[PDB]
Design a protein around this ligand. Structure first.
Ligand SMILES: OC[C@H]1O[C@@H](O[C@@H]2[C@@H](O)[C@H](O[C@@H]3[C@@H](O)[C@H](O[C@@H]4[C@@H](O)[C@H](O)O[C@H](CO)[C@H]4O)O[C@H](CO)[C@H]3O)O[C@H](CO)[C@H]2O)[C@H](O)[C@@H](O)[C@@H]1O
Ligand SMILES: CCCCCCCCCC(=O)O[C@H](COC(=O)CCCCCCC)COP(=O)(O)OCCN
Ligand SMILES: CCCCCCCCCCCCCC
Ligand SMILES: CCCCCCCCCCCC
Ligand SMILES: CCCCCCCCCCCC
Ligand SMILES: CCCCCCCCCCCC
Ligand SMILES: CCCCCCCCCC
Ligand SMILES: CCCCCCCCCC
Ligand SMILES: CCCCCCCCCC
Ligand SMILES: CCCCCCCCCC
Ligand SMILES: CCCCCCCCCC
Ligand SMILES: CCCCCCCCCC
Ligand SMILES: CCCCCCCCC
Ligand SMILES: CCCCCCCCC
Ligand SMILES: CCCCCCCCC
Ligand SMILES: CCCCCCCCC
Ligand SMILES: CCCCCCCCC
Ligand SMILES: CCCCCCCCC
Ligand SMILES: CCCCCCCCC
Ligand SMILES: CCCCCCC
Ligand SMILES: CCCCCCC
Ligand SMILES: CCCCCCC
Ligand SMILES: CCCCCCC
Ligand SMILES: CCCCCCC
Ligand SMILES: CCCCCCC
Ligand SMILES: CCCCCCC
Length: 1503
């Protein structure tokens, strides 16, 4: 018997016979495929059965007609009111507010659909379904389908076609109006070569995709660009004669690009322009206030000048946005009409300032110069507030004239955000008001106020040196100012980290506080969740409130709790003597003889679960998750149907048999069977017990296959353990209604058949086996076994068939095979349906296409789309009637969507819910426990919303199918393949909520076109919430790294200034003896104290935003480790010990986010090492020149970043694997061998030149002698040293290369060997010559080496960029030179690293310790080869002993290169060399001069 909720009622308007005739009529008179008509007829009736199972059929049909075409929710009405009768701006106006006109048409539409007959509505819905089920891959472009549907309906509703009596040929709709569009889509890629298709290589800015292809149908002036074959526009023809000529149009003169994304940094200035306005514009005022050194009017005038900057960003953003949209495409006049209103505000804000600034000096105008400057400070505060609110894409729009288009993007498909009202609307303002209040309040007292003394000191004090030779002392006189500039600049980036710092705190405080105020899970009443289980199971899993005959509320709970436990036992998770204490036992009544129900001892108040196993983990969560409020479920006779999708490219259905044993000692450990036995050694015993009991053969082989496949990672386990929905639905049905059992008691087969029939009508499984036609003969047997095991599965695959005639592409179908179909002699089943596609439906590279070709067969109302590896245990598979109630449609009352009056302000179902994610974060003794809970909460709140925006689990099919698909992938767009659907269903109108009582079971997109639609149009609270989660987290990790390279550049300048000064001794209590006791000195102690207050605040932002993830990634073990650490540090150094222990976290994180030395070192060089060395030399110079106390907190961090990958290797430190690794390293080193274009050159040259000038300036000043009291004609001429020590090694390399080329002209291994040998030695010797030139002074030599390295790097980069921007011998010279120079660095830098491990090998036994530590870290299927005989042992010892001598000789050479000048610095006691006229005092003039010219001396000049 057929669909029983529509066909078996006496109130349905139309019968199935009158429904099938309509589907046959349209097929006959339009040419739809016969197998697609038979498919959509079943999909339309299943969808009408379920929705009519909880209401009346007369209302079910109306609700279906109001959700596909015609209601306020349907996408067709929204397209009709926006691209067929204009009226796009009147929709944006209404949304902002929350004869022609708008009501005069909305009322007409609403009163026209109200007088339709039930037999006339079916004809409307079927026409949409038949088009949607056949237009392949045009489903990604929703609007094309609406246009085609309108054309077809117009043709069918004209009286002319009625007289014609010959029907269109079959397969016409596909070969005539759908195939040209697909041919256009495919040809934008995949150029044809001689025989096949290959990926055409072209710039990713001339490739139109689906987003550009469907965007043409949003405007009436976009629809009017369709040109036919002959040349005329398509609008000329009448409405009725427009469908026939729809195959003549050429889709190549009609489609354009419409976004055209540019460079990356040009997008961030115009998308998030409300973050650069409320930070920079206030950082200006804060400093301009307390900086009098550049009266009282000038103070307010210079503070109010910060309203000009708050408008300059708003001008430079509109100017950048001018280069995204096309020229004349709708939404361009608004840019030009807004650029001329921004200039007026800029002019007004800059006007009176020019007056007040330069018209005040000692004239009679003080009366009218303070009033004009006090009002500008209040005008330039209105501008800052008005530009931090009021989205960029929507301001100055009320005042605009009619024009044509008022907005820049469509306000009905790009901006329809759900209002989010209720209580969250009020709790969303508070979170941001408090955050910004706290940030702006404490960022002024601890970051800007204590910086007003160094500003006054450093801006006035002047130096006295001799100076250089080409520019005298003009550069050494203004040093303090150069230091002050860098100090402010590096404190402008630390102003952006603070606001992300406060967002973490104020978002955890609210979560904890509200979860306490709601009283859910207060403290931890652990013996309460188990205490009251039955009352919760009787009201949250059974729908008894509408079942009546209230009787025996314990037998039902008994049945449910017995089944849930017996299943766990059957999975071999509990012992047989263990389940007896954990089950509802029934015992006969000794009083009379009747029956009695008992309860478990576990369950009223002893190894209840074995050693905190998976059984404990599951029964804990199941009982703990019923506390949270859960909506009341419906009876199992009224729940809607649903479906499960799963893709499959190439996975393993089963373990085979050769793969289970194989060979043992050729990989890790032994055979996989014994591996699994060792991993889980109790259920193997349960399995063998059951096998013996059954045996009380190949089938044993099959059972072993099954037992292995349920473990490891296959596709059979997902299907086997994910089909528990069927068992749950049968169990709930039989438990709920007992009368059905008694009517035919004694017929177990009949009862089973009834239950199966009911549970087969409410759950469908669908797996999309792509490329099933070309499986191997062994691989197809597993697929054939799946259908035999479960005779209700459904598979969809891509068939194929030879072309009709030679020369054309083959025709490929799309087929579905069930498990109840009859088998053929070929060994394959007859497909139930076969729909012809229009070509290879795979053009991308993701899984989107595979999900798309099989989305036709999705019968139901909701979809759970899963991955290829899921668990979904049975206990969490029982509350499926409650998670489907999040889609709040099950308990409502229908209100006849079409009705007179009731305008669109007082409706309720306006924003339906689209996606429903699942709960993804899986979890003084009392004080320690509370602190641990708070730390876990803080760790969760980091990803409480970060990874939870659009991760989809359930999908509203009706909503997310008529507009786009379930997910999209293309070469053009690139979001995440998984975050696109959730971020695109939010700005079409839908909502996104998520349940928290369900276990799931599991930048390059800054250039997207949806960040542009979101960050330019969202309201303020929503924009801040969106920004500080996805883009803000990625953009924060770039500021932390950028604010640690600006610090090393100011430390060098500020420590090269404290090394040549007297410093005016200063006490930090009350140093107001304003005589500056060393008399004549200049005090820099407050400036030097700034370093102490920066290291303190750069580690707070580290111990709150990077350490809490150690809990997440170390929750494996560490409770006992923490207990042991507390025991071993109960009376230790306390804070000092904790601080020193706060260094292993960086190493752990680095190694976790991170083996031969060659590969290990080459994988990290260029990302953490090449920067580490250059940032370590600078720190060494800084810590040698002045040695501030809080500077060794950087040494640990920089030393634990380049030593982490080399400490967590399995076997490295023993004695000889090290030397074999060294052998391999040496061999590899010997044979290693490694305005449209003005942005490429400046992308990587400007920051590499500023960083070089910053070091050159610091190097010149330390040589420029100060306080020396000499004559003018001394100077130092220190510039020439840099030129000598920079370009000379390049000259030597080039000369050697030329000489060796000539010698080859008149066995290249020796060539390379000698070249490398001289290249290393030249750099090592010119390291020494720079030390010699500075008269053997270490401190003023380190800064000479660093600047030489920087200048060489700059030269190489610029030369490479030039030689590739703009001759072949020149190329083969420059490339070789660059490689030969970089080889010396690659030979020195790593080789030093490998020397520092020398003292860590002399330990008599270290490998045992290291192995113990790494094994505690994790075991990984260990292995140890005992393959050792005399011959190779002798060879091993020979080679190991032979290379140790070279390893301890290179170390001696390096040590003798350093100790030499350190002992040769004593014998020499005079100046070295005397020259004149441009090289005078070339080496370094002073040998015994002093720089302490302080004391009673009253007036001296010493120029
Ligand atoms: O790229 C995608 C993935 O990015 C992952 O995050 C890493 C990010 O951690 C890395 O930044 C580090 C810096 O953190 C490090 O500076 C240290 C500070 O973090 C700390 O607070 O203070 C010490 C003081 O010594 C600093 O050294 O410096 C290194 C040096 O390069 C940076 O790498 O940057 C990576 C590339 O930008 C980035 O990938 C993220 O966790 C993943 O989720 C993401 O997929
Ligand atoms: C005194 C001895 C050393 C002489 C060093 C000669 C460098 C000669 C020039 C060069 O090689 O400079 C850089 C490499 O700098 C470095 O190794 C700096 C670290 C040096 C540590 C020395 C410790 C004693 C090239 O960097 P890249 O262009 O590779 O960076 C972009 C990514 N590819
Ligand atoms: C007003 C603030 C200006 C900030 C400019 C920052 C420039 C940084 C240049 C150096 C970056 C690191 C180069 C290795
Ligand atoms: C009743 C009006 C409430 C307005 C709330 C605005 C919140 C703005 C937060 C960010 C300010 C910079
Ligand atoms: C009159 C002397 C003015 C000197 C200004 C120096 C500014 C340095 C800015 C550095 C930014 C990275
Ligand atoms: C009036 C003298 C100006 C001297 C040149 C200053 C250049 C500053 C560049 C700073 C780079 C970090
Ligand atoms: C001050 C912010 C202006 C935009 C900064 C962009 C940083 C990333 C560039 C790649
Ligand atoms: C925008 C310039 C405003 C000039 C005001 C002058 C006032 C003069 C009062 C005597
Ligand atoms: C929420 C705190 C707002 C500012 C409180 C007062 C700060 C000090 C004013 C003197
Ligand atoms: C809400 C945090 C406010 C912090 C105020 C810091 C200054 C306290 C008074 C000096
Ligand atoms: C002169 C002070 C030196 C302090 C130690 C510098 C080297 C530290 C290596 C960890
Ligand atoms: C952990 C290493 C500590 C080194 C201290 C160096 C002190 C130098 C004082 C001049
Ligand atoms: C001295 C600073 C006063 C306040 C500046 C404007 C703050 C706007 C939120
Ligand atoms: C500082 C102003 C930059 C403006 C860039 C305009 C780019 C147009 C292609
Ligand atoms: C003494 C009269 C001063 C009036 C100032 C008016 C300023 C208007 C912007
Ligand atoms: C001399 C002090 C004048 C202060 C004027 C304040 C005006 C506020 C709108
Ligand atoms: C001088 C103290 C200024 C404090 C400003 C607080 C602003 C809160 C929005
Ligand atoms: C960036 C936050 C700095 C917080 C400093 C607090 C200092 C307390 C003594
Ligand atoms: C203000 C944005 C541009 C900054 C200079 C160019 C940076 C290129 C990496
Ligand atoms: C801090 C900006 C100063 C502007 C006035 C300079 C004369
Ligand atoms: C534009 C800010 C400075 C004005 C100076 C006028 C002399
Ligand atoms: C001196 C008071 C400091 C309070 C800090 C609160 C975060
Ligand atoms: C005469 C000035 C020469 C400057 C050279 C800078 C590298
Ligand atoms: C005194 C001139 C300005 C110095 C600071 C610029 C950031
Ligand atoms: C905030 C400006 C950053 C410029 C340098 C980017 C590498
Ligand atoms: C005459 C001033 C020259 C400055 C050079 C800075 C690199």
């Amino acid at each position: 018997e057929p669909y029983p909720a529509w066909t078996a009622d006496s109130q349905s308007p139309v019968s199935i016979e009158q429904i099938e005739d309509i589907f046959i009529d349209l097929t006959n008179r339009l040419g739809f495929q016969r197998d697609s008509m038979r498919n959509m007829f079943d999909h339309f009736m299943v969808l009408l059965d379920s929705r009519s199972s909880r209401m009346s059929p007369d209302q079910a049909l109306l609700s279906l007609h109001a959700d596909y075409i015609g209601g306020d929710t349907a996408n067709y009405k929204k397209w009709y009111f926006a691209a067929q009768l204009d009226m796009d701006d009147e929709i944006g106006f209404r949304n902002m507010s929350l004869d022609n006109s708008l009501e005069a048409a909305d009322f007409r539409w609403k009163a026209k659909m109200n007088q339709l007959s039930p037999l006339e509505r079916v004809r409307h819905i079927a026409l949409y379904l038949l088009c949607w089920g056949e237009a392949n891959q045009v489903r990604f472009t929703a609007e094309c389908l609406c246009f085609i549907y309108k054309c077809a309906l117009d043709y069918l509703d004209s009286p002319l076609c009625q007289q014609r009596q010959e029907p269109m040929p079959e397969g016409d709709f596909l070969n005539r109006v759908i195939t040209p569009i697909y041919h256009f889509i495919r040809n934008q890629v995949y150029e044809i070569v001689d025989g096949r298709f290959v990926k055409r290589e072209r710039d990713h800015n001339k490739i139109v995709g689906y987003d550009d292809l469907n965007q043409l149908f949003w405007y009436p002036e976009g629809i009017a660009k369709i040109v036919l074959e002959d040349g005329t526009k398509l609008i000329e023809l009448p409405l009725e004669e427009r469908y026939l000529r729809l195959g003549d149009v050429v889709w190549d003169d009609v489609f354009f690009k419409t976004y055209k994304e540019t460079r990356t940094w040009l997008h961030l200035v115009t998308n998030f322009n409300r973050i650069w306005v409320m930070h920079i514009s206030i950082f200006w005022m804060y400093f301009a206030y307390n900086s009098p050194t550049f009266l009282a009017a000038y103070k307010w005038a210079s503070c109010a000048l910060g309203g000009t900057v708050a408008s300059l960003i708003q001008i430079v953003a509109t100017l950048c946005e001018w280069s995204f949209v096309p020229r004349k495409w709708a939404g361009a006049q608004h840019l030009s009409r807004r650029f001329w209103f921004l200039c007026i505000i800029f002019g007004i804000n800059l006007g009176p300032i020019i007056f007040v600034f330069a018209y005040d000096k000692d004239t009679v105008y003080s009366t009218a110069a303070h009033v004009v400057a006090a009002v500008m400070f209040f005008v330039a505060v209105a501008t800052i507030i008005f530009f931090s609110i009021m989205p960029l894409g929507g301001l100055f729009t009320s005042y605009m004239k009619k024009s044509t288009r008022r907005y820049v993007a469509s306000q009905t498909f790009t901006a329809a955000f759900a209002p989010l009202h209720g209580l969250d609307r009020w709790m969303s303002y508070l979170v941001w008001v408090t955050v910004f209040a706290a940030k702006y309040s404490e960022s002024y007292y601890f970051l800007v106020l204590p910086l007003r003394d160094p500003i006054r000191i450093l801006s006035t004090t002047a130096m006295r040196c001799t100076g250089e030779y080409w520019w005298g002392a003009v550069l050494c006189k203004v040093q303090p100012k150069i230091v002050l500039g860098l100090v402010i600049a590096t404190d402008f980036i630390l102003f952006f980290l603070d606001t992300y710092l406060w967002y973490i705190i104020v978002n955890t405080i609210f979560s904890v506080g509200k979860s306490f105020y709601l009283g859910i899970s207060i403290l931890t009443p652990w013996r309460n969740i188990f205490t009251r289980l039955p009352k919760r199971i009787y009201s949250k899993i059974l729908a008894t409130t509408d079942m009546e005959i209230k009787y025996k509320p314990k037998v039902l709970i008994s049945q449910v709790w017995n089944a849930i436990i017996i299943s766990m036992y059957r999975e071999h998770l509990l012992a047989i003597d263990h389940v007896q204490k954990l089950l509802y036992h029934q015992v006969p009544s000794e009083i009379e003889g009747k029956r009695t129900l008992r309860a478990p001892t576990f369950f009223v108040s002893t190894e209840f679960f074995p050693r905190d196993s998976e059984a404990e983990r599951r029964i804990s969560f199941f009982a703990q998750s019923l506390s949270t409020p859960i909506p009341e479920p419906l009876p199992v006779d009224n729940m809607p149907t649903f479906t499960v999708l799963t893709p499959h490219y190439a996975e393993r259905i089963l373990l085979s048999l050769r793969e289970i044993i194989r060979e043992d000692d050729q990989f890790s450990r032994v055979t996989l069977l014994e591996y699994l036995k060792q991993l889980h050694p109790v259920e193997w015993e349960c399995f063998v017990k059951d096998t013996k009991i059954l045996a009380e053969a190949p089938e044993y082989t099959l059972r072993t296959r099954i037992w292995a496949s349920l473990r490891s990672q296959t596709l059979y386990r997902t299907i086997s353990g994910f089909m528990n929905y069927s068992r749950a639905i049968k169990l709930l049905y039989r438990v709920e209604n007992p009368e059905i059992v008694q009517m035919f008691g004694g017929n177990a087969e009949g009862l089973e058949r009834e239950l199966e029939k009911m549970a087969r009508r409410k759950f469908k499984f669908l797996v999309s086996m792509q490329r099933l036609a070309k499986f191997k003969p062994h691989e197809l047997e597993n697929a054939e076994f799946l259908l035999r095991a479960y005779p209700d599965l459904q598979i969809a695959y891509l068939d194929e068939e030879p072309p009709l005639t030679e020369g054309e592409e083959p025709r490929i179908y799309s087929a579905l095979i069930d498990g109840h179909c009859e088998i053929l002699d070929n060994g394959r089943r007859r497909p139930k349906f076969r729909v012809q596609l229009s070509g290879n439906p795979i053009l991308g590279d993701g899984k989107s296409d595979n999900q798309n070709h099989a989305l036709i067969f999705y019968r139901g109302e909701y979809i759970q789309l899963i991955d290829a590896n899921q668990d979904n245990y049975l206990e969490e598979c029982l509350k499926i009637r409650s998670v489907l109630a999040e889609f709040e449609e099950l308990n409502v009352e229908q209100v006849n969507p079409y009705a007179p009056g009731l305008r669109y302000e007082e409706q309720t179902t306006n924003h339906p819910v689209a996606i429903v994610g699942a709960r993804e974060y899986i979890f003084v003794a009392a004080g320690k426990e509370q602190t641990f809970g708070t730390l876990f909460a803080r760790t969760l709140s980091q990803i409480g919303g970060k990874l939870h925006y659009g991760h989809p689990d359930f999908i509203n099919a009706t909503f997310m199918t008529t507009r786009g698909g379930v997910s999209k992938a293309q070469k053009g767009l690139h979001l995440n393949e998984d975050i696109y659907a959730g971020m695109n269903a939010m700005l079409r109108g839908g909502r996104i909520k998520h349940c928290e009582y369900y276990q799931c079971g599991k930048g390059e997109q800054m250039l997207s076109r949806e960040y542009y639609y979101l960050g330019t149009q969202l309201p303020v609270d929503r924009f801040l919430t969106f920004y500080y989660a996805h883009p803000g987290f990625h953009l924060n990790n770039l500021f932390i790294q950028l604010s640690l390279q600006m610090f090393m550049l100011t430390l060098v300048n500020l420590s090269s200034l404290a090394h040549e000064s007297i410093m005016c001794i200063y006490d930090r209590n009350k140093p107001k003896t304003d005589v500056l006791v060393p008399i004549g000195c200049y005090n820099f102690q407050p400036a030097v104290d700034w370093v102490r207050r920066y290291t303190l605040s750069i580690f707070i932002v580290f111990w709150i935003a990077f350490v809490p993830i150690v809990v997440q990634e170390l929750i494996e073990r560490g409770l006992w480790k923490a207990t042991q650490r507390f025991f071993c540090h109960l009376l230790s150094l306390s804070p000092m010990f904790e601080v020193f222990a706060g260094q292993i976290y960086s190493s752990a994180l680095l190694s976790d986010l991170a083996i031969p030395f060659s590969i290990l070192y080459s994988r990290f060089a260029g990302s953490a090492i090449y920067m580490g060395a250059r940032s370590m030399l600078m720190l060494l110079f800084g810590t040698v020149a002045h040695w501030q106390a809080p500077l060794l907190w950087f040494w640990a961090s920089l030393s634990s970043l380049i030593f982490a990958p080399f400490v967590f290797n399995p076997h490295q430190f023993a004695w000889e694997d090290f030397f074999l690794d060294y052998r391999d390293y040496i061999r590899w080193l010997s044979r290693g061998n490694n305005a449209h274009r003005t942005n490429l050159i400046m992308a990587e040259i400007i920051p590499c030149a500023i960083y070089a000038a910053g070091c050159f300036i610091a190097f010149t000043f330390i040589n420029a002698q100060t306080g020396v009291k000499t004559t003018d004609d001394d100077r130092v001429n220190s510039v020439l040293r840099i030129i000598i020590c920079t370009l000379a090694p390049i000259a030597v390399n080039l000369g050697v290369l030329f000489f060796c080329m000539g010698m080859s002209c008149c066995t290249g291994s020796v060539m390379a060997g000698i070249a490398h040998g001289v290249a290393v030695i030249v750099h090592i010797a010119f390291f020494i010559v720079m030390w010699v030139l500075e008269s053997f002074n270490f401190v003023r030599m380190l800064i000479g080496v660093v600047t030489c390295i920087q200048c060489q790097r700059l030269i190489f980069h610029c030369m490479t960029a030039l030689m590739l921007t703009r001759t072949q011998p020149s190329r083969e010279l420059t490339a070789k030179v660059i490689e030969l120079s970089e080889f010396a660095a690659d030979f020195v830098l790593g080789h030093v690293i490998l020397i520092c491990q020398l003292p860590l090998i002399i330990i008599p036994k270290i490998d045992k310790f290291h192995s113990i530590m790494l094994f505690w870290l994790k075991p990984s299927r260990q292995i140890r080869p005992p393959i050792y005989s005399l011959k190779q042992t002798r060879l091993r010892k020979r080679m190991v002993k032979k290379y140790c001598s070279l390893y301890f000789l290179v170390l001696a050479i390096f040590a003798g290169c350093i100790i030499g000048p350190a002992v040769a610095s004593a014998k020499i006691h005079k100046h070295i060399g005397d020259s004149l006229d441009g090289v005078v005092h070339n080496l370094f003039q002073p040998i015994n001069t002093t720089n302490n010219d302080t004391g009673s001396q009253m007036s001296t000049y010493q120029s």
